[PDB]
Amino acid sequence: SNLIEVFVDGQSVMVEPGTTVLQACEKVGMQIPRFCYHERLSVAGNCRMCLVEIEKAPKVVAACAMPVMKGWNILTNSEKTKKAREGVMEFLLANHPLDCPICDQGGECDLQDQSMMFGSDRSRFLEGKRAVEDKNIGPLVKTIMTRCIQCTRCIRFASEIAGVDDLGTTGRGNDMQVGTYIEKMFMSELSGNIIDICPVGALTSKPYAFTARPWETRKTESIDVMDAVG
Amino acid sequence: RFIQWLRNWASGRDLQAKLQLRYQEISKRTQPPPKLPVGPSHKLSNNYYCTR
Ligand code: SF4
Numbered sequence A: 001s002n003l004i005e006v007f008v009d010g011q012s013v014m015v016e017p018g019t020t021v022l023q024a025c026e027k028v029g030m031q032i033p034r035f036c037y038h039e040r041l042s043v044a045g046n047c048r049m050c051l052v053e054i055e056k057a058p059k060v061v062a063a064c065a066m067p068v069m070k071g072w073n074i075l076t077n078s079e080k081t082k083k084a085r086e087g088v089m090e091f092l093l094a095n096h097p098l099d100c101p102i103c104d105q106g107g108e109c110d111l112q113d114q115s116m117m118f119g120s121d122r123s124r125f126l127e128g129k130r131a132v133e134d135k136n137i138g139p140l141v142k143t144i145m146t147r148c149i150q151c152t153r154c155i156r157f158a159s160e161i162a163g164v165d166d167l168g169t170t171g172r173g174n175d176m177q178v179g180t181y182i183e184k185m186f187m188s189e190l191s192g193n194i195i196d197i198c199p200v201g202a203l204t205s206k207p208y209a210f211t212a213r214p215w216e217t218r219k220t221e222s223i224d225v226m227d228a229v230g
Numbered sequence B: 001r002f003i004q005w006l007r008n009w010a011s012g013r014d015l016q017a018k019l020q021l022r023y024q025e026i027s028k029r030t031q032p033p034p035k036l037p038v039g040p041s042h043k044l045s046n047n048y049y050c051t052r
């Protein structure tokens, strides 16, 4: 009742009528690459990394924002999907500078755990690499806005849960930027909690800045006691 | 000389295959700067992933 069997790689599963292709393929234990998407946020689509070749169609669709019709064959690995996940993640790895000796998210960036598995082998660009300038906002958010692959993820968070309407999009085409037009500081509750959301190492912590790389720590779970909600 | 042929009566006679390469006709040095060819499908427009 209230379901459609969709053959995800030729294998049945019953979802709600009106869910997403991403949640369907994640239900059967698979990962499609995720840049312009978050579960705890709204949904946009302007990275165009999830691209699956749907069966009985010459075109390619993106799994972020579309419903699922009567049961398709969501052909995950094809000889054309790998001509797309290689495709998009060759452009955005060009207009970007050669950091990571010094990029402080250097052990967990999503241009670094996608780029071994998916994507191409070498480069053919071979000169270019625009370089914008940075600024300061508060004494907590160490700020390199050069890297900033414009996935529109920090931007919606101002309209999301933290209701401070502060950020925007300034520019057109190749040249757009993310930061505040005026030099207004941005600080309230949750204001230091953006540096987890930024999926590359363009945003990071100010006191933590230059200490140690994230493959030497020992992750032990615990609880903080500085408030009554735990 | 007379100490020479006593080495040539004993255990045959070699006179050329010395146990040292310390003399001449050991390769001393090499001049040119090297450059390496980059061959195996390193190029573009056909060399392309999902084929390899
Ligand atoms: S901070 Fe950088 S990575 Fe994060 S949403 Fe803005 S442009 Fe994209």
Ligand code: SF4
Residues within 6 Å of the ligand: A096, A098, A099, A100, A103, A105, A106, A109, A110, A111, A112, A147, A200, A201, A202
């Ligand atoms: S954030 Fe990504 S692209 Fe930038 S230096 Fe780190 S791994 Fe490289």
Ligand code: FES
Residues within 6 Å of the ligand: A033, A034, A035, A036, A037, A044, A045, A046, A047, A048, A049, A050, A051, A062, A063, A064
């Ligand atoms: S993954 Fe966000 S649009 Fe393709």
